[PDB]
Design a protein around this ligand. Structure first.
Ligand SMILES: *[C@@H]1O[C@H](CO)[C@@H](O[C@@H]2O[C@H](CO)[C@@H](O)[C@H](O)[C@H]2NC(C)=O)[C@H](O)[C@H]1NC(C)=O
Ligand SMILES: *[C@@H]1O[C@H](CO)[C@@H](O[C@@H]2O[C@H](CO)[C@@H](O)[C@H](O)[C@H]2NC(C)=O)[C@H](O)[C@H]1NC(C)=O
Ligand SMILES: CCCCCCCCO[C@@H]1O[C@H](CO)[C@@H](O)[C@H](O)[C@H]1O
Ligand SMILES: CCCCCCCCO[C@@H]1O[C@H](CO)[C@@H](O)[C@H](O)[C@H]1O
Ligand SMILES: CCCCCCCCO[C@@H]1O[C@H](CO)[C@@H](O)[C@H](O)[C@H]1O
Ligand SMILES: *[C@@H]1O[C@H](CO)[C@@H](O)[C@H](O)[C@H]1NC(C)=O
Ligand SMILES: *[C@@H]1O[C@H](CO)[C@@H](O)[C@H](O)[C@H]1NC(C)=O
Ligand SMILES: *[C@@H]1O[C@H](CO)[C@@H](O)[C@H](O)[C@H]1NC(C)=O
Ligand SMILES: *[C@@H]1O[C@H](CO)[C@@H](O)[C@H](O)[C@H]1NC(C)=O
Lengths: 552, 552
């Protein structure tokens, strides 16, 4: 019934009903006008014929290694490039946020209520004839069918970019501070009221949880010593709630910021690393400031670790999966003369695209042993023995799965992968081609153009019938990968704007915060600005083992 | 004890202890360097010699009624001027926010915890030898003494700027939506988690309260008809929490968004007027959108009313107290090519300076009658007896009291005045001159320069002893007023930045929100862009009585 169900407004113009069967497009500040915001203005037609495709820009970024070697060694040139990639990725994101799962129009409820994941595209209205608006059948194809035919793993397909388990667990650990779905309320709801990098997965979301985790001495986090090694404290000791099956012994019920980090030893490994890092920074800050009390030591350390995180995420993590020869750089100052909002709201689609299930291996290989999922889940005794030591060394060695390309979702987590599809439909996501348009990408004209092959393309065409009906999440895992890349075009071009917004939108990146006294002076500032995944491990893991997000 | 107790860093530089008896100033981006950030750079002294005193600018704005008459009638010129007053006032505010009552250093707790008022200047550390840091005696002068000698009203001093009771009650009504002090936690905390103009004083702070105030038909708020007039619903009907003395009859316990608006008929006057305006906009939207449902009518009306409020506050309210001949303008588009953060955190000092108790008259004059405080408080039967039209007419006529100039706080609210002083101290406010320096004002060299006279100055000198120990709140009420103005220099130069940040920081002012379709189309958009306190009253008060913020 809703006349806006067909999504008739193009180029990010907004649709509004004006009658029971009539609509209007608001073309304000789109660069276009006309009934559907499709006829371009003069300056717009100039930009459109000058803006290179994302695949072209990707090509330039991933080739000419010698040229980028010169550029990377020229500070003013490097900063200039990093500035551009920052600003253009940012303008793609609505900030302050607009829609959520219950509001396909701007409202104060949608803006103010921090319990919602925001939304990059409004939901399809409930009174639309089809799930995607007006196209397709009354029901989307059977999600079991999609899952089994084009997503499930026959045999392991390794990432050609060489991502390892250090990367995969880092991705899970890091993003689980802002992907905290409130399952009581629904998939479109979050428990992460910070909506970004606040390290609540280390420090707890609430003050009460934080204080239970605190030592209240020298700014430090509580911990225990097992075999001369430092590990998180137990549930019995701190009384903080953790999720654990009942058969788990008390001495292994480790207590950390995120309640669910006890379920994967890979998570607990990073939880331990960061706990050691915080207490390390406390020691440094106490050395510099003997006059400081516990509270200032703790807070400043936390601000420093927030900095380290953002540093490591941009210059190691995002650097690795980008495949760029250009050396990405964390430098807040690059935005000081730019128009930029120091705020973020985490989008539901950013949650959805991050369901990187095919990253997981068939078995978790730690030195001699090869563990199954059942052996690996809720099992921290694995962590203890092999250690922080062998865990880093082993996870650095083991290859991870390719995400795009199709048919690489491990069978164990098929329930989780089906859930991703079903919840996307529950939240009334628009089609793949809609999101591609929302992010300045050309819509696919066939399933073959999407997959880059024929077998899976034919399978999808039988299921969905029309390419404009194809859903975002399955397309992300079945999309044609870039040449020897882990990802297709859609994943990168959606993920990068969301990610950099989250990273740079942090208050510590704002001019009033980005100065040495915020971090206890030059020494604390230095810890931020020289952070790396390697130094993170080196300072806190015994023996300083080598590490990387890629297989050696 | 603390080496930063004497506030050694000048020009917004940040002090940090580097030992038990050593400090360091972070002079980053201040334009100054050196130990205390006092020796300027080249561009600094240029600007310093080019930037005129606030009194110079105030003089130019409040003179040449004939020249401004031309400027105002030239759209591009007015826009250009308004842009300048907007950008410059805004840059004075820290955004994202920094300190609060418990944190004299940047911390994630201070940033993320919305229950705090923020603070333009950090508190004086608890271990400092004197209340203001280093200067003065161990004890501030007796607040009762300060109160009775330079604050209490002898005889009513009328505002020479002509502010009426429509102004005073609007000021109390409008600001109580973001000055919602949570006295259970302390004076440094707030219940207004939206930290701005969200109209929670009409719609309720929480969702369940909003729903109790809602009719769930045509987007409208619940109401009742008494005589033949529309009034807010009862507590009995809506079951919402209001604050009433136990002797107030059930048919007079009106239910509104703000729980305390039932205690002052002037507040209930505005609550009624805005309730009518919401339901009126619902009728307009429903006419334009017969296809819309209750929820979208409510949300869109709330967005429009948020717009009307900001429009009126800038072009009528702030316009009136500025005294400017230049016609201020509400136009979000002015900031679209400017660096500006669409966010805001209510500052404690903004709350403090906004306690304009001397605005209150000796009696409340409504047509025939003249009511004392005891008769006026809690007495909505007065509002029913006289009606909205008589209220508006009477309050438009009645002059309000002068705020600066000293000795004009009525004896009834002397308890409130003392709490202002007392709570500023509890919250460890820095001295008046520290706040003047914070806001680019020259520090007062003597009590005589502060007051502009001799008697009060002498009393103040015997009480505080040193001018650099003078407190902010009494200084504001005692400060020498501008010629025929309601305020002195400090009130205006502190108040304008906080105010315009709150007004323009609102998300509806952002380019993503500021378009017709946000407000249900061109018709809804016109309601915002043509709003005035006059039109508000004319549309919603029987007979369309004349109104203004100044005595006719
Ligand atoms: C944000 O919105 C959600 C969804 O409307 C609110 O959660 C509802 O709260 C009411 C209480 O008034 C309950 O009756 C509902 O069952 C809740 N629904 C869900 C899905 O949880 C939530 O209260 C809102 N948050 C704020 C701060 O207003
Ligand atoms: C914001 O800060 C206040 C002040 O610390 C927090 O309130 C305290 O909460 C603890 C429990 O965690 C109580 O024991 C204290 O009595 C509270 N103090 C006051 C003054 O209320 C509050 O929890 C914080 N809010 C959030 C959302 O973190
Ligand atoms: C040419 C090498 C430096 C260019 C760095 C560009 C970084 C990514 O830039 C992206 O390009 C996309 C395609 O044009 C656009 O869709 C995005 O808006 C933009 O963020
Ligand atoms: C000259 C008429 C146009 C100028 C309008 C300026 C409106 C108020 O301008 C203010 O002036 C103050 C005094 O310098 C400064 O402290 C503030 O930064 C600035 O906003
Ligand atoms: C109605 C006035 C009540 C408050 C005044 C009580 C405190 C007395 O205070 C005195 O008041 C004198 C008369 O104004 C002044 O001349 C003195 O400067 C002042 O100290
Ligand atoms: C606008 O879009 C609608 C739906 O996509 C279509 O029916 C209509 O013809 C379009 N109008 C123009 C002028 O392109
Ligand atoms: C947990 O790991 C240990 C190895 O340390 C293994 O022996 C044990 O069987 C595992 N637990 C489960 C339930 O599989
Ligand atoms: C810096 O400030 C402190 C305290 O205000 C003062 O004692 C000191 O002399 C100042 N030093 C300089 C170089 O101005
Ligand atoms: C309230 O005002 C009415 C006038 O309408 C008056 O009759 C009544 O006495 C007042 N009540 C109090 C408690 O002053």
């Amino acid at each position: 019934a809703n006349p806006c169900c067909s999504n008739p407004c193009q180029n990010r113009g907004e649709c509004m009903s004006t009658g029971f069967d009539q609509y209007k497009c608001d073309c304000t500040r789109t660069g276009f006008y006309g009934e559907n915001c499709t006829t371009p203005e003069f300056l717009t037609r100039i930009k459109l014929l000058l803006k290179p495709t994302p695949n072209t820009v990707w090509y330039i970024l991933t080739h000419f290694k010698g040229v980028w070697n010169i550029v990377n060694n020229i500070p003013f040139l490097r900063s200039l490039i990093m500035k551009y990639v920052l600003t253009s990725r940012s303008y793609l994101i609505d900030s302050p946020p607009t829609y959520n799962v219950h509001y396909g129009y701007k409202s104060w409820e949608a803006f103010s209520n921090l319990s919602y994941y925001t939304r990059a595209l409004p939901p399809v209205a409930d009174d639309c004839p089809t799930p995607m608006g007006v196209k397709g059948n009354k029901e989307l194809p059977d999600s079991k069918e999609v899952l089994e035919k084009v997503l499930l793993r026959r045999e392991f397909i390794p990432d050609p970019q060489g991502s390892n388990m250090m990367f995969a667990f880092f991705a899970q650990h890091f993003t689980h501070q802002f992907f905290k779905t409130d399952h009581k309320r629904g998939p479109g709801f979050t428990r992460g009221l910070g909506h970004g990098v606040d390290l609540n997965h280390i420090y707890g979301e609430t003050l009460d949880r934080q204080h239970k985790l605190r030592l209240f001495k020298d700014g430090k986090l509580k911990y225990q010593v097992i075999g001369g090694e430092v590990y998180p404290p137990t549930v019995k000791d701190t009384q903080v709630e953790m999720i654990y099956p009942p058969h788990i012994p008390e001495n292994l019920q480790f207590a950390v910021g995120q309640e669910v980090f006890g379920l994967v030893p890979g998570l607990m490994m990073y939880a331990t690393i960061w706990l050691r890092e915080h207490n390390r920074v406390c020691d440094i800050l106490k050395q510099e400031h003997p006059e400081w009390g516990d509270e200032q030591l703790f807070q400043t350390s936390r601000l420093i670790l927030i900095g380290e995180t953002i540093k490591i995420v941009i210059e190691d993590y995002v650097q690795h999966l980008s495949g760029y020869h250009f050396k990405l750089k964390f430098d807040p100052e690059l935005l000081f003369n730019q128009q930029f909002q120091y705020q973020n709201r985490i989008a539901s689609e950013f949650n959805t695209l991050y369901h990187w299930h095919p990253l997981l291996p068939d078995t978790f290989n730690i030195e001699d042993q090869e563990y199954s999922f059942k052996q690996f889940l809720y099992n921290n005794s694995i962590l203890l023995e092999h250690g922080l030591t062998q865990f880093v060394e082993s996870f650095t060695r083991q290859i991870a799965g390719r995400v795009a390309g199709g048919r690489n979702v491990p069978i164990a987590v098929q329930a989780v992968a089906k859930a991703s599809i079903d919840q996307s439909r529950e939240m009334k996501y628009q089609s793949l081609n809609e999101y591609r348009k929302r992010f300045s990408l050309k819509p696919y004209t066939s399933f073959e153009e999407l997959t880059g092959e024929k077998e899976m393309a034919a399978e999808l065409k039988a299921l969905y019938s029309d390419i404009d009906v194809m859903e975002l999440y399955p397309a992300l895992l079945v999309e044609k990968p870039r040449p020897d890349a882990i990802f297709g075009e859609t994943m990168v071009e959606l993920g990068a704007p969301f990610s950099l917004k989250g990273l740079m939108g942090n208050p510590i990146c704002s001019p009033q915060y980005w100065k040495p006294s915020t971090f206890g002076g030059e020494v604390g500032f230095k810890i931020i600005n020289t952070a790396s995944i390697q130094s993170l491990i080196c300072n806190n893991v015994k023996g300083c083992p080598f590490t990387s997000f890629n297989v050696q």
